[PDB]
Amino acid sequence: GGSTRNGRDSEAKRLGVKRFGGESVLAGSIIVRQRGTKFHAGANVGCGRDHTLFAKADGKVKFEVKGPKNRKFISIEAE
Amino acid sequence: PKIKTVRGAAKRFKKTGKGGFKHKHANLRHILTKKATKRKRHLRPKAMVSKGDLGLVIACLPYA
Amino acid sequence: GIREKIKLVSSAGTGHFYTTTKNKRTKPEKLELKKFDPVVRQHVIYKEAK
RNA sequence: CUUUAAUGUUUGAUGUUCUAACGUUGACCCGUAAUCCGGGUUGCGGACAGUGUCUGGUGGGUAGUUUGACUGGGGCGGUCUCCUCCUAAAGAGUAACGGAGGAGCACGAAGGUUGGCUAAUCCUGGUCGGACAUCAGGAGGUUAGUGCAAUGGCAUAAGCCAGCUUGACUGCGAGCGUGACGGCGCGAGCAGGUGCGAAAGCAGGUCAUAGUGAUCCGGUGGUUCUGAAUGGAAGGGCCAUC
RNA sequence: AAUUCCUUGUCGGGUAAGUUCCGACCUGCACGAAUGGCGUAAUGAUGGCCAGGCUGUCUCCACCCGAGACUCAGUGAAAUUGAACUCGCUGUGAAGAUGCAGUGUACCCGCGGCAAGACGGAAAGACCCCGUGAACCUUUACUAUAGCUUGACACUGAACA
RNA sequence: GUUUAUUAAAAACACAGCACUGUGCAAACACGAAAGUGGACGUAUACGGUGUGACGCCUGCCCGGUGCCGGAAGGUUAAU
RNA sequence: UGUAACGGGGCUAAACCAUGCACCGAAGCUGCGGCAGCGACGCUUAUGCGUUGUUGGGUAGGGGAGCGUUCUGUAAGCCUG
RNA sequence: AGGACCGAACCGACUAAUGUUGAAAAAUUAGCGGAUGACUUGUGGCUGGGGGUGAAAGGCCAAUCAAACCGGGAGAUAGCU
RNA sequence: UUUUGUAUAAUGGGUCAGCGACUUAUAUUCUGUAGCAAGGUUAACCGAAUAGGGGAGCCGAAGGGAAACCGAGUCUUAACU
RNA sequence: CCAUAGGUUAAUGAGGCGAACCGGGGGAACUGAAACAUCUAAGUACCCCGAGGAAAAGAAAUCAACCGAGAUUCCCCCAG
């Protein structure tokens, strides 16, 4: 028969890279599709809707593993 | 003779102070219940022609 | 496409209205909601459909 | 006022009669020692036929055209837009008529908030309960569940229940992501009004990613905008929407 | 079977041998009754098959007579043609070489012949595909339209139920 | 008998016959923008169109579909 | 079609493995002579230049600078029996 | 008598060979079909291009025919060579 | 010439001589150059006429908004927030 | 019967040709829209009629905007 169909996305991964000086609201990890690979806990709580993680203060990205579940968190720390 | 402007383009675009043209955003004519208010609110103002389309608009409008 | 488009008309006397969808097979009653009327700048009752 | 076997007095369907327009490719006369055509006499038909304008039907008898693309040549078959996984080489992207599946919705609650709660499965005693209906106990730990495909999620649950409710608000929006563009997506925060909470606070739709269609043209509601001498209006514009 | 794919169906005849022929069977892929069905004397430069005669059609060619071809004198074209000092083989190579590589062979130049090659000459392939190409034809494609037809008004009037 | 005069002469076309159907004469039909003309100086034993194709024996069933013919009760329906 | 599956002759090393030195070998590099583009300094201006470093394969294409032909002014000038 | 039979003129064109830069832009040679008839032929006329005419092949209409020829729109258009 | 690629057995050309293909008009943008400098410049026409006149007009110095309107601000919006 | 129709004679004018321009009657298609039918090409090509040295048009039942201009024609702007 026939089985040749596919969808499209054009980004699916992080943009902030833990040295990245992201200001204001830059999407640190857009189209993660989900709050579980990365959580936002440094600059308050990101993860608005479609779980896009974004900065809330002008500063450097921070990647870290916290919690009892060994979950990965994106933080924003000041320069 | 004189160049004749594309009158449809003259209806879709108006010129600004530094050069470059201002148009109306699409997707606000029709079937608007589906669209969110954020989307229609962002489509309400006028936008600028975006530098790949400027050559086409300047070609269509020799008197602007 | 069983859901059909209806209006919600302000009870504050203005011409302002919202639009939404509703299926009359399961919800034949008229939908009433407190919505913001920007002409009056207050939350008022919106009920009337097209 | 609905009606009267003479009166103030119309409209429309067939039917009959008349002649006087019109027809006569009936007979006779003249132009004329002309099958034409006129004029005249008469007969027959007669407000019919026929013609003009408008109009419904029929109309390849003609006329102008259309009748897609991909494609391991073309045709047949299949496909064309959107979502999920793999291919895809640990950033993004990435092709094939490659391998698999779904979507063209639903929900005024299945949205918001507050408070509360935790599954699948297995082993046992008891009303048709039997292997599986409902209890009670133990093991187990998310093997469940998510309104619907798949993937990534999810216990602080986004999974289940209840109360109150409409933030499925309006105008904006620093800053980004993604596109050649049209566009699409994410967004803290500001103002005005809400809802739920004692409060911190949360809410600009649903766990996220499919559920869609530009422009033109036109319809509907609103509008201290325009309105081709002036006052209006028609029409146009702007906002919401179809 | 002008119709049967299977198929050279099967049976019989003809032949030493017959995918064709003739006569049947019916298992008619997919005959059939004025798109006419079946038959039919005569007719046919009609299609298929058989036989007698006849023969160079053939076994298998032989000889002869004429017109050319050959030589001489006179007149005198053509297609074609990038240039040529214009071999064979094997390999290579835009994938079938006169020209490239290796090798072999070959004194220079005519004349009569044959056509294996020069992917020979001729004709911007007609088959196939493509072009938002053309023409003509068809229809139950779309949009018109001549004609045919329906009614209203006018030409076109008067009485009576 | 005729035919693609220049690759097809045939089983093709035509044909006499047969049938269906139209046509009442200013006929149908055709050419024509119209006058007019052919049909025809004919008149249903005539003329046109269609299909079949001497002759012999025949031509069965189906009117659901599409045409054509007949009818106007009802529905729909134009200009006005 | 003809050796035709080292290019050939031919090779028992003129084959293969290991080590070493030498040489050949290109339009590469260097030497010598010449031309041109681009950049950086110096003497300072429609600046002549010098020093120095480097560059110069090119299709489509872009940029720059020119040769030659006919005609017009210069031209009743100049050349020319 | 006969769209009768055989067969010349006449009309045609079934087969073969030659010719295929031909003697000829369809013929020659040897046979072949009709040859009193729906025959053949001379002269003149008429029918004109979405038209005519056609015993029908899309045949023929001046060596041109699924729309003649000439002139014009016209340098149609050509995403092709 | 066309190509991924041609000695290609893909195209074209027998040869020579002559002719043969990016032009012209108007409008618009950009560059070089020249004049003038918040100004620049005229068209038709007049004119012994390349002079001179003619400033009709065109472009620029101001934008924002759909528009009225406002104006170094203006739109959006109750709100330069 | 009157008369008209007709006939004859005479006078005057016309006829036909010609390159362009002009007015009127009729009037395409190729093409462009990247197909095509509204549209375009274009009232162009072409055909026909008529006239003149020019033709046509022409003295407001015209514009304008509360101010005003004062027939027609042609050129430059307005203005793509």
mmCIF file of all heavy atoms in Angstrom, chain D residues 166-177:
data_model
loop_
_atom_site.group_PDB
_atom_site.id
_atom_site.type_symbol
_atom_site.label_atom_id
_atom_site.label_comp_id
_atom_site.label_asym_id
_atom_site.label_seq_id
_atom_site.Cartn_x
_atom_site.Cartn_y
_atom_site.Cartn_z
ATOM 1 P P U D 166 -18.602 34.186 37.415
ATOM 2 O OP1 U D 166 -18.770 35.595 37.843
ATOM 3 O OP2 U D 166 -19.789 33.376 37.055
ATOM 4 O "O5'" U D 166 -17.607 34.178 36.179
ATOM 5 C "C5'" U D 166 -16.224 34.469 36.352
ATOM 6 C "C4'" U D 166 -15.378 33.952 35.209
ATOM 7 O "O4'" U D 166 -15.552 32.517 35.087
ATOM 8 C "C3'" U D 166 -15.688 34.540 33.837
ATOM 9 O "O3'" U D 166 -14.480 34.643 33.087
ATOM 10 C "C2'" U D 166 -16.586 33.478 33.207
ATOM 11 O "O2'" U D 166 -16.591 33.472 31.796
ATOM 12 C "C1'" U D 166 -15.995 32.193 33.783
ATOM 13 N N1 U D 166 -16.958 31.091 33.910
ATOM 14 C C2 U D 166 -16.855 30.021 33.049
ATOM 15 O O2 U D 166 -16.016 29.947 32.170
ATOM 16 N N3 U D 166 -17.786 29.038 33.248
ATOM 17 C C4 U D 166 -18.777 29.003 34.201
ATOM 18 O O4 U D 166 -19.537 28.036 34.246
ATOM 19 C C5 U D 166 -18.813 30.141 35.060
ATOM 20 C C6 U D 166 -17.922 31.118 34.887
ATOM 21 P P G D 167 -13.651 36.019 33.041
ATOM 22 O OP1 G D 167 -13.564 36.592 34.402
ATOM 23 O OP2 G D 167 -14.185 36.843 31.930
ATOM 24 O "O5'" G D 167 -12.193 35.554 32.617
ATOM 25 C "C5'" G D 167 -12.008 34.666 31.519
ATOM 26 C "C4'" G D 167 -10.707 33.909 31.611
ATOM 27 O "O4'" G D 167 -9.611 34.846 31.795
ATOM 28 C "C3'" G D 167 -10.609 32.900 32.750
ATOM 29 O "O3'" G D 167 -9.877 31.758 32.309
ATOM 30 C "C2'" G D 167 -9.810 33.652 33.808
ATOM 31 O "O2'" G D 167 -9.100 32.824 34.703
ATOM 32 C "C1'" G D 167 -8.875 34.505 32.952
ATOM 33 N N9 G D 167 -8.466 35.753 33.599
ATOM 34 C C8 G D 167 -9.310 36.767 33.965
ATOM 35 N N7 G D 167 -8.697 37.770 34.522
ATOM 36 C C5 G D 167 -7.363 37.401 34.527
ATOM 37 C C6 G D 167 -6.230 38.101 35.004
ATOM 38 O O6 G D 167 -6.186 39.215 35.537
ATOM 39 N N1 G D 167 -5.066 37.371 34.816
ATOM 40 C C2 G D 167 -5.002 36.133 34.237
ATOM 41 N N2 G D 167 -3.780 35.594 34.153
ATOM 42 N N3 G D 167 -6.052 35.471 33.784
ATOM 43 C C4 G D 167 -7.197 36.161 33.952
ATOM 44 P P A D 168 -10.653 30.480 31.726
ATOM 45 O OP1 A D 168 -11.977 30.391 32.386
ATOM 46 O OP2 A D 168 -9.728 29.326 31.758
ATOM 47 O "O5'" A D 168 -10.917 30.847 30.202
ATOM 48 C "C5'" A D 168 -9.835 31.111 29.319
ATOM 49 C "C4'" A D 168 -10.280 31.225 27.881
ATOM 50 O "O4'" A D 168 -10.841 29.964 27.438
ATOM 51 C "C3'" A D 168 -11.329 32.291 27.581
ATOM 52 O "O3'" A D 168 -11.004 32.903 26.331
ATOM 53 C "C2'" A D 168 -12.620 31.483 27.457
ATOM 54 O "O2'" A D 168 -13.603 32.076 26.637
ATOM 55 C "C1'" A D 168 -12.112 30.176 26.866
ATOM 56 N N9 A D 168 -12.930 29.004 27.177
ATOM 57 C C8 A D 168 -13.058 28.381 28.391
ATOM 58 N N7 A D 168 -13.842 27.335 28.365
ATOM 59 C C5 A D 168 -14.244 27.257 27.043
ATOM 60 C C6 A D 168 -15.081 26.367 26.353
ATOM 61 N N6 A D 168 -15.698 25.334 26.926
ATOM 62 N N1 A D 168 -15.275 26.573 25.034
ATOM 63 C C2 A D 168 -14.664 27.605 24.442
ATOM 64 N N3 A D 168 -13.851 28.506 24.984
ATOM 65 C C4 A D 168 -13.679 28.272 26.296
ATOM 66 P P C D 169 -11.385 34.435 26.019
ATOM 67 O OP1 C D 169 -12.769 34.683 26.499
ATOM 68 O OP2 C D 169 -11.092 34.623 24.577
ATOM 69 O "O5'" C D 169 -10.302 35.323 26.798
ATOM 70 C "C5'" C D 169 -10.460 35.712 28.160
ATOM 71 C "C4'" C D 169 -11.308 36.947 28.325
ATOM 72 O "O4'" C D 169 -11.277 37.359 29.714
ATOM 73 C "C3'" C D 169 -10.850 38.175 27.557
ATOM 74 O "O3'" C D 169 -11.328 38.181 26.229
ATOM 75 C "C2'" C D 169 -11.399 39.320 28.388
ATOM 76 O "O2'" C D 169 -12.778 39.513 28.112
ATOM 77 C "C1'" C D 169 -11.274 38.764 29.807
ATOM 78 N N1 C D 169 -10.035 39.177 30.515
ATOM 79 C C2 C D 169 -9.834 40.486 30.979
ATOM 80 O O2 C D 169 -10.687 41.359 30.756
ATOM 81 N N3 C D 169 -8.683 40.782 31.629
ATOM 82 C C4 C D 169 -7.767 39.847 31.859
ATOM 83 N N4 C D 169 -6.656 40.180 32.515
ATOM 84 C C5 C D 169 -7.952 38.518 31.418
ATOM 85 C C6 C D 169 -9.086 38.232 30.782
ATOM 86 P P U D 170 -10.425 38.765 25.044
ATOM 87 O OP1 U D 170 -11.166 38.511 23.788
ATOM 88 O OP2 U D 170 -9.044 38.261 25.223
ATOM 89 O "O5'" U D 170 -10.404 40.335 25.298
ATOM 90 C "C5'" U D 170 -11.404 41.178 24.747
ATOM 91 C "C4'" U D 170 -11.155 42.624 25.084
ATOM 92 O "O4'" U D 170 -11.101 42.790 26.529
ATOM 93 C "C3'" U D 170 -9.832 43.203 24.618
ATOM 94 O "O3'" U D 170 -9.780 43.520 23.244
ATOM 95 C "C2'" U D 170 -9.664 44.397 25.543
ATOM 96 O "O2'" U D 170 -10.517 45.459 25.147
ATOM 97 C "C1'" U D 170 -10.190 43.823 26.855
ATOM 98 N N1 U D 170 -9.096 43.269 27.690
ATOM 99 C C2 U D 170 -8.315 44.155 28.414
ATOM 100 O O2 U D 170 -8.478 45.363 28.425
ATOM 101 N N3 U D 170 -7.318 43.576 29.153
ATOM 102 C C4 U D 170 -7.022 42.239 29.237
ATOM 103 O O4 U D 170 -6.096 41.858 29.940
ATOM 104 C C5 U D 170 -7.851 41.388 28.457
ATOM 105 C C6 U D 170 -8.839 41.919 27.748
ATOM 106 P P G D 171 -8.418 43.257 22.439
ATOM 107 O OP1 G D 171 -8.734 43.222 20.995
ATOM 108 O OP2 G D 171 -7.739 42.102 23.069
ATOM 109 O "O5'" G D 171 -7.526 44.535 22.752
ATOM 110 C "C5'" G D 171 -8.022 45.849 22.539
ATOM 111 C "C4'" G D 171 -7.176 46.874 23.250
ATOM 112 O "O4'" G D 171 -7.149 46.586 24.667
ATOM 113 C "C3'" G D 171 -5.712 46.912 22.849
ATOM 114 O "O3'" G D 171 -5.500 47.688 21.686
ATOM 115 C "C2'" G D 171 -5.025 47.485 24.084
ATOM 116 O "O2'" G D 171 -5.092 48.902 24.088
ATOM 117 C "C1'" G D 171 -5.907 46.963 25.214
ATOM 118 N N9 G D 171 -5.335 45.817 25.944
ATOM 119 C C8 G D 171 -5.692 44.497 25.838
ATOM 120 N N7 G D 171 -5.030 43.719 26.643
ATOM 121 C C5 G D 171 -4.197 44.584 27.333
ATOM 122 C C6 G D 171 -3.239 44.320 28.338
ATOM 123 O O6 G D 171 -2.943 43.237 28.840
ATOM 124 N N1 G D 171 -2.610 45.478 28.765
ATOM 125 C C2 G D 171 -2.863 46.734 28.289
ATOM 126 N N2 G D 171 -2.157 47.739 28.819
ATOM 127 N N3 G D 171 -3.751 46.992 27.346
ATOM 128 C C4 G D 171 -4.375 45.879 26.918
ATOM 129 P P C D 172 -4.379 47.269 20.621
ATOM 130 O OP1 C D 172 -4.472 48.207 19.482
ATOM 131 O OP2 C D 172 -4.507 45.827 20.362
ATOM 132 O "O5'" C D 172 -3.005 47.524 21.381
ATOM 133 C "C5'" C D 172 -2.198 46.446 21.831
ATOM 134 C "C4'" C D 172 -1.307 46.890 22.960
ATOM 135 O "O4'" C D 172 -1.802 46.387 24.224
ATOM 136 C "C3'" C D 172 0.131 46.410 22.927
ATOM 137 O "O3'" C D 172 0.944 47.134 22.020
ATOM 138 C "C2'" C D 172 0.555 46.588 24.372
ATOM 139 O "O2'" C D 172 0.848 47.947 24.649
ATOM 140 C "C1'" C D 172 -0.724 46.214 25.118
ATOM 141 N N1 C D 172 -0.727 44.822 25.635
ATOM 142 C C2 C D 172 0.084 44.454 26.726
ATOM 143 O O2 C D 172 0.822 45.297 27.260
ATOM 144 N N3 C D 172 0.043 43.186 27.184
ATOM 145 C C4 C D 172 -0.761 42.295 26.615
ATOM 146 N N4 C D 172 -0.768 41.055 27.099
ATOM 147 C C5 C D 172 -1.598 42.636 25.518
ATOM 148 C C6 C D 172 -1.552 43.894 25.071
ATOM 149 P P G D 173 2.099 46.391 21.188
ATOM 150 O OP1 G D 173 2.875 47.425 20.473
ATOM 151 O OP2 G D 173 1.476 45.290 20.420
ATOM 152 O "O5'" G D 173 3.040 45.747 22.297
ATOM 153 C "C5'" G D 173 3.965 46.533 23.033
ATOM 154 C "C4'" G D 173 4.517 45.771 24.210
ATOM 155 O "O4'" G D 173 3.430 45.191 24.968
ATOM 156 C "C3'" G D 173 5.409 44.589 23.874
ATOM 157 O "O3'" G D 173 6.744 44.985 23.637
ATOM 158 C "C2'" G D 173 5.256 43.693 25.095
ATOM 159 O "O2'" G D 173 6.040 44.179 26.170
ATOM 160 C "C1'" G D 173 3.796 43.922 25.456
ATOM 161 N N9 G D 173 2.888 42.923 24.869
ATOM 162 C C8 G D 173 2.047 43.135 23.811
ATOM 163 N N7 G D 173 1.333 42.094 23.502
ATOM 164 C C5 G D 173 1.723 41.138 24.422
ATOM 165 C C6 G D 173 1.285 39.804 24.582
ATOM 166 O O6 G D 173 0.445 39.187 23.923
ATOM 167 N N1 G D 173 1.934 39.177 25.635
ATOM 168 C C2 G D 173 2.876 39.754 26.435
ATOM 169 N N2 G D 173 3.376 38.970 27.396
ATOM 170 N N3 G D 173 3.298 40.998 26.302
ATOM 171 C C4 G D 173 2.680 41.630 25.280
ATOM 172 P P A D 174 7.652 44.218 22.564
ATOM 173 O OP1 A D 174 7.524 44.922 21.267
ATOM 174 O OP2 A D 174 7.361 42.767 22.638
ATOM 175 O "O5'" A D 174 9.121 44.463 23.114
ATOM 176 C "C5'" A D 174 9.503 45.755 23.557
ATOM 177 C "C4'" A D 174 10.376 45.697 24.782
ATOM 178 O "O4'" A D 174 9.598 45.245 25.919
ATOM 179 C "C3'" A D 174 11.531 44.717 24.705
ATOM 180 O "O3'" A D 174 12.661 45.251 24.042
ATOM 181 C "C2'" A D 174 11.788 44.382 26.165
ATOM 182 O "O2'" A D 174 12.519 45.418 26.799
ATOM 183 C "C1'" A D 174 10.371 44.383 26.720
ATOM 184 N N9 A D 174 9.757 43.051 26.650
ATOM 185 C C8 A D 174 8.711 42.677 25.855
ATOM 186 N N7 A D 174 8.351 41.430 25.989
ATOM 187 C C5 A D 174 9.227 40.954 26.938
ATOM 188 C C6 A D 174 9.376 39.699 27.523
ATOM 189 N N6 A D 174 8.617 38.637 27.235
ATOM 190 N N1 A D 174 10.352 39.590 28.438
ATOM 191 C C2 A D 174 11.133 40.615 28.758
ATOM 192 N N3 A D 174 11.084 41.840 28.269
ATOM 193 C C4 A D 174 10.103 41.938 27.359
ATOM 194 P P G D 175 13.146 44.639 22.641
ATOM 195 O OP1 G D 175 14.417 45.307 22.277
ATOM 196 O OP2 G D 175 12.006 44.656 21.697
ATOM 197 O "O5'" G D 175 13.472 43.120 22.973
ATOM 198 C "C5'" G D 175 14.479 42.775 23.909
ATOM 199 C "C4'" G D 175 14.223 41.413 24.492
ATOM 200 O "O4'" G D 175 12.840 41.299 24.910
ATOM 201 C "C3'" G D 175 14.404 40.255 23.539
ATOM 202 O "O3'" G D 175 15.762 39.913 23.354
ATOM 203 C "C2'" G D 175 13.581 39.161 24.198
ATOM 204 O "O2'" G D 175 14.289 38.592 25.283
ATOM 205 C "C1'" G D 175 12.412 39.959 24.768
ATOM 206 N N9 G D 175 11.212 39.907 23.910
ATOM 207 C C8 G D 175 10.667 40.920 23.166
ATOM 208 N N7 G D 175 9.592 40.563 22.521
ATOM 209 C C5 G D 175 9.405 39.232 22.857
ATOM 210 C C6 G D 175 8.404 38.307 22.459
ATOM 211 O O6 G D 175 7.438 38.476 21.709
ATOM 212 N N1 G D 175 8.590 37.061 23.036
ATOM 213 C C2 G D 175 9.615 36.749 23.881
ATOM 214 N N2 G D 175 9.649 35.499 24.341
ATOM 215 N N3 G D 175 10.552 37.596 24.261
ATOM 216 C C4 G D 175 10.395 38.814 23.714
ATOM 217 P P C D 176 16.395 39.904 21.879
ATOM 218 O OP1 C D 176 17.740 40.526 21.938
ATOM 219 O OP2 C D 176 15.380 40.425 20.932
ATOM 220 O "O5'" C D 176 16.581 38.358 21.568
ATOM 221 C "C5'" C D 176 15.645 37.676 20.757
ATOM 222 C "C4'" C D 176 15.123 36.434 21.428
ATOM 223 O "O4'" C D 176 13.828 36.714 22.031
ATOM 224 C "C3'" C D 176 14.852 35.274 20.490
ATOM 225 O "O3'" C D 176 16.015 34.522 20.207
ATOM 226 C "C2'" C D 176 13.779 34.491 21.225
ATOM 227 O "O2'" C D 176 14.353 33.726 22.271
ATOM 228 C "C1'" C D 176 12.958 35.619 21.850
ATOM 229 N N1 C D 176 11.813 36.074 21.009
ATOM 230 C C2 C D 176 10.707 35.269 20.663
ATOM 231 O O2 C D 176 10.636 34.093 21.044
ATOM 232 N N3 C D 176 9.721 35.804 19.903
ATOM 233 C C4 C D 176 9.773 37.067 19.494
ATOM 234 N N4 C D 176 8.780 37.551 18.748
ATOM 235 C C5 C D 176 10.857 37.905 19.832
ATOM 236 C C6 C D 176 11.820 37.374 20.580
ATOM 237 P P G D 177 16.362 34.129 18.694
ATOM 238 O OP1 G D 177 17.799 33.783 18.623
ATOM 239 O OP2 G D 177 15.812 35.187 17.814
ATOM 240 O "O5'" G D 177 15.516 32.808 18.445
ATOM 241 C "C5'" G D 177 15.552 31.736 19.372
ATOM 242 C "C4'" G D 177 14.425 30.772 19.125
ATOM 243 O "O4'" G D 177 13.166 31.394 19.471
ATOM 244 C "C3'" G D 177 14.240 30.348 17.680
ATOM 245 O "O3'" G D 177 15.130 29.318 17.297
ATOM 246 C "C2'" G D 177 12.773 29.945 17.635
ATOM 247 O "O2'" G D 177 12.592 28.641 18.161
ATOM 248 C "C1'" G D 177 12.151 30.939 18.605
ATOM 249 N N9 G D 177 11.526 32.102 17.944
ATOM 250 C C8 G D 177 11.945 33.401 18.021
ATOM 251 N N7 G D 177 11.179 34.227 17.372
ATOM 252 C C5 G D 177 10.182 33.427 16.841
ATOM 253 C C6 G D 177 9.063 33.758 16.039
ATOM 254 O O6 G D 177 8.720 34.869 15.623
ATOM 255 N N1 G D 177 8.306 32.642 15.720
ATOM 256 C C2 G D 177 8.585 31.363 16.121
ATOM 257 N N2 G D 177 7.746 30.402 15.722
ATOM 258 N N3 G D 177 9.623 31.040 16.869
ATOM 259 C C4 G D 177 10.377 32.112 17.193
#
